[PDB]
Amino acid sequence: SEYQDGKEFGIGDLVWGKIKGFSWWPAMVVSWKATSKRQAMSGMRWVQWFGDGKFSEVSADKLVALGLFSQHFNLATFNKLVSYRKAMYHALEKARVRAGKTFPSSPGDSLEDQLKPMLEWAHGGFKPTGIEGLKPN
């Protein structure tokens, strides 16, 4: 029922979302019931931002699939803000689990170290699954 408005994106979808004064940031579409807030208005979606876990209401027409990765990733913000690197880690970890992807680990690799192969995977088109692997189920 919720979000059945003929527009894009449903509960669980991984997305980039854009707030004024902010880069595109990774998020997951959620039900209004998870937010402790209120039902969304027409054509809007509740999203939860990776990294800080906060909830925002955003137009379905203003979200893009996380799978358009290199297009929306912002290297300048990544190098400038630890909060963006953490967001990218949590977003890509969710993507990895969904795709059944694995990466060679080694304690105690830092944040940047863990991110390196995840970012290469994302920039490379999420092989072998492709973006189909990012879908919820």
Ligand X SMILES: CCCN(CCO)CCCCCO
| Cα distance between the two ends of the chain | 17
Tell me if 113 contacts a copy of itself by CB under 8 A: no
The contact mask relative to a copy of itself for 56-75 (x = CB under 8 A, - = no) is ---x----------------
* Residue among 22, 39, 111, 120 that touches a copy of itself (CB under 8 A): 39
Q: How far is the CB of 115 from ligand X (least distance, A)?
A: 17
> Which amino acid makes up residue 125?
G
Tell me if 111 contacts ligand X by CB under 6 A: no
Tell me if 37 contacts ligand X by CB under 6 A: no
Of 54 and 116, the one with the shorter C-beta distance to ligand X is 54
Q: Is residue 69 within 8 Å of 50, Cβ to Cβ?
A: no
Query: How far, in Å, CA of 60 to CA of 96, rounded?
Result: 24
Burial class (CB in 10 A: 0-12, 13-18, 19+), 126: buried
Structure tokens at 25: 């940031």
Of 1 and 71, the one with the shorter C-beta distance to a copy of itself is 1
Q: How far is the CB of 4 from a copy of itself (least distance, A)?
A: 5
* 119: helix, strand or coil: helix
- Per-residue burial over 104-125, b = 16 or more CB atoms within 10 Å of its CB, e = otherwise: eeeeeeeeeebbebbbebbeee
Residues that bind ligand X (CB under 6 A): 19, 22, 25, 49, 52, 54, 56, 81, 83
Residues that bind a copy of itself (CB under 8 A): 1-6, 12, 20-21, 28, 30-43, 48, 50-55, 59, 90, 94, 97, 105, 107
